[PDB]
Scaffold this active site. Structure first.
Site, PDB file in Angstrom:
ATOM      1  N   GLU A  61      16.140 -63.982 -32.736  1.00 22.42           N
ATOM      2  CA  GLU A  61      14.984 -64.846 -33.088  1.00 22.42           C
ATOM      3  C   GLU A  61      15.145 -66.050 -32.250  1.00 22.42           C
ATOM      4  O   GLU A  61      16.179 -66.687 -32.311  1.00 22.42           O
ATOM      5  CB  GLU A  61      14.990 -65.227 -34.534  1.00 22.42           C
ATOM      6  CG  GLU A  61      14.598 -64.037 -35.359  1.00 22.42           C
ATOM      7  CD  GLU A  61      14.580 -64.319 -36.836  1.00 22.42           C
ATOM      8  OE1 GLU A  61      15.658 -64.406 -37.434  1.00 22.42           O
ATOM      9  OE2 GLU A  61      13.460 -64.491 -37.355  1.00 22.42           O
ATOM     10  N   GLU A 119      17.768 -56.228 -43.230  1.00 21.43           N
ATOM     11  CA  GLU A 119      17.298 -56.613 -41.882  1.00 21.43           C
ATOM     12  C   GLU A 119      18.437 -57.198 -41.054  1.00 21.43           C
ATOM     13  O   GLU A 119      19.236 -58.001 -41.566  1.00 21.43           O
ATOM     14  CB  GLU A 119      16.201 -57.651 -42.101  1.00 21.43           C
ATOM     15  CG  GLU A 119      15.609 -58.297 -40.898  1.00 21.43           C
ATOM     16  CD  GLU A 119      14.586 -59.385 -41.222  1.00 21.43           C
ATOM     17  OE1 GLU A 119      14.279 -59.674 -42.424  1.00 21.43           O
ATOM     18  OE2 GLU A 119      14.047 -59.944 -40.278  1.00 21.43           O
ATOM     19  N   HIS A 122      20.880 -59.888 -42.743  1.00 16.47           N
ATOM     20  CA  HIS A 122      20.318 -60.136 -44.094  1.00 16.47           C
ATOM     21  C   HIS A 122      20.437 -58.881 -44.935  1.00 16.47           C
ATOM     22  O   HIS A 122      19.558 -58.039 -44.875  1.00 16.47           O
ATOM     23  CB  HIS A 122      18.839 -60.385 -44.027  1.00 16.47           C
ATOM     24  CG  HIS A 122      18.431 -61.595 -43.306  1.00 16.47           C
ATOM     25  ND1 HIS A 122      17.955 -62.715 -43.937  1.00 16.47           N
ATOM     26  CD2 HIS A 122      18.301 -61.830 -41.974  1.00 16.47           C
ATOM     27  CE1 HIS A 122      17.561 -63.588 -43.030  1.00 16.47           C
ATOM     28  NE2 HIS A 122      17.778 -63.079 -41.811  1.00 16.47           N
ATOM     29  N   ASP A 157      18.651 -59.379 -37.773  1.00 15.18           N
ATOM     30  CA  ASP A 157      17.899 -60.139 -36.769  1.00 15.18           C
ATOM     31  C   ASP A 157      18.770 -60.314 -35.536  1.00 15.18           C
ATOM     32  O   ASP A 157      19.572 -61.249 -35.448  1.00 15.18           O
ATOM     33  CB  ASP A 157      17.408 -61.438 -37.343  1.00 15.18           C
ATOM     34  CG  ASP A 157      16.442 -61.245 -38.426  1.00 15.18           C
ATOM     35  OD1 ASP A 157      15.575 -60.321 -38.334  1.00 15.18           O
ATOM     36  OD2 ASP A 157      16.424 -61.925 -39.460  1.00 15.18           O
TER      37      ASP A 157
END
Ligand SMILES: *[C@@H]1O[C@H](CO)[C@@H](O)[C@H](O)[C@H]1NC(C)=O
Length: 431
Positions: free
Chosen positions: A212, A207, A223, A209
């Protein structure tokens, strides 16, 4: 899961732009689709639910394969039930709509395929309006290593696919996903809230991101997982960090990195008003086959180009981009194990980017950690004065789902002007 026919599935349009250095930017007729967890699931031959509240019907769903054969995902009233609207270029995701809380949608190339973005030696750009997005909420825009068909080619029991938002996975290997690998995740089903539960399997994948955030804090975080693509897990393989995936991620939150006045209400990046967020994925040799070496962030607001804030933590070089070396340094500084490097660091993140990833957009609250990890102290048992503990100025008491859902239900995030392509080509500058 089966494909239901009780409610037509009409994906809202959300145009994006693909950009090249020489050619500039051109529109793509992309769409969005609601994730399968939020949908009605009912018997394929009628209207009886297979899942109501936080429990499965064990008559229709005695085991995961039988449930998937018997149960269908159906179409969604995007605005009426979920508070999701699009102008055709700007997506508004409202927080509470009736008894529904939050949403997650994916960007689609067409009605049966997610858009597969390949962002090595490329950038991704968008506008966000967080004016009405407070502590405890998270308006997230991110990449997951999902299959473009939501898993249909791999899993005979999934006849619904990308059209109905199947096949999620992320770096937390979530076990609250109702359909994984074409099977309903009903084994040892455990209630976790009025509308949620967990089963015996989780669903893991790398992932990125990109964003966020709420109007108090923002973070961008790769990640990596050691695995490649969407992987069902059982047991300690699902275990965050120690299992297949780096659950913590190598994060860059300006406030956590020691700059408390860059991003927030009235700050350099003024979260009280819309702004543009550019994220660039550089490779060591500036090619699309190279090794991801740096993730850069540039903001634009009121026509001002705003470079990312510099880290200001003892033991961490004062840089403003994510690198392998910055990650090693901030993990040591913060006392966090470098699960990121263990899973393959930026190289491994980069191969996930190279293989193609699906764009998710969401608004949510956090039943597990109350969003404290984003905008407050975490862990809630560590000293806030220690490096890395403090990530924003939200109260340690904020973000409890039950409080946010009654106090600020009409919170929303707006994501617009989505663009991707060559580095330096999704935006321009001039004197
Ligand atoms: C890659 O591009 C960067 C600009 O971010 C430039 O500094 C560098 O010279 C390039 N490296 C190579 C090997 O071409």
């Amino acid at each position: 899961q089966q494909a239901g026919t009780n409610t037509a599935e009409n994906h809202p349009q959300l145009q994006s732009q693909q950009c090249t250095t020489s050619g500039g930017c051109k529109p793509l007729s992309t769409k969005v689709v609601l994730d399968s967890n939020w949908r009605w699931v009912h018997s394929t031959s009628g209207y009886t639910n297979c899942y109501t509240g936080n429990e499965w019907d064990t008559s229709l769903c005695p085991d995961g394969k039988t449930c998937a054969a018997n149960c269908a995902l159906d179409g969604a009233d995007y605005s009426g039930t979920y508070g999701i609207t699009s102008t055709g270029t700007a997506l508004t995701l409202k927080f509470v709509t009736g008894s529904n809380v939050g949403s997650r949608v994916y960007l689609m190339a067409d009605d049966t395929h997610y858009q597969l973005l390949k962002l090595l030696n490329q950038e991704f750009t968008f506008d966000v309006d967080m004016s009405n997005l407070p502590c405890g909420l998270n308006g997230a825009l991110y990449l997951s290593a999902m299959d473009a068909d939501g898993g249909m080619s791999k899993y005979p029991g999934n006849k619904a696919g990308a059209k109905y938002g199947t096949g999620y996975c992320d770096s937390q290997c979530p076990k609250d996903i109702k359909f994984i690998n074409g099977e309903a995740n009903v084994g040892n089903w455990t209630e976790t809230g009025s509308n949620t539960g967990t089963g015996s399997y989780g669903t893991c994948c790398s992932e990125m991101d990109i964003w966020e955030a709420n109007n108090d804090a923002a973070a961008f975080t790769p990640h990596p997982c050691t695995t490649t693509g969407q992987t069902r897990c059982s047991g300690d393989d699902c275990a965050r960090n120690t299992g297949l995936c780096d659950g913590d991620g190598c994060d860059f939150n300006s406030f956590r990195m020691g700059d408390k006045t860059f991003l927030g209400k009235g700050m350099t990046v003024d979260t009280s008003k819309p702004f543009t967020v550019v994220t660039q994925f550089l490779t060591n040799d500036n090619t699309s086959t190279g090794t991801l070496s740096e993730i850069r962030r540039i903001y634009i607001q009121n026509g001002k180009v705003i470079q990312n804030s510099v880290a200001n933590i003892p033991g961490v070089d004062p840089v403003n981009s994510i690198t392998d070396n910055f990650c090693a340094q901030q993990k040591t500084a913060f006392g966090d194990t470098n699960w990121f490097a263990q899973k393959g660091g930026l190289k491994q993140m980069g191969e996930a980017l190279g293989n193609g990833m699906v764009l998710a957009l969401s608004i949510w609250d956090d039943h597990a950690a109350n969003m404290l990890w984003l905008d407050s102290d975490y862990p809630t048992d560590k000293d806030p004065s220690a490096p890395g503990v403090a990530r924003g100025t939200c109260a340690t008491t904020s973000g409890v789902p039950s409080d946010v859902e009654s106090q600020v239900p009409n919170s929303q995030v707006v994501f617009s002007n989505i663009k991707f392509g060559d580095i330096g080509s999704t935006f321009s500058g001039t004197s």
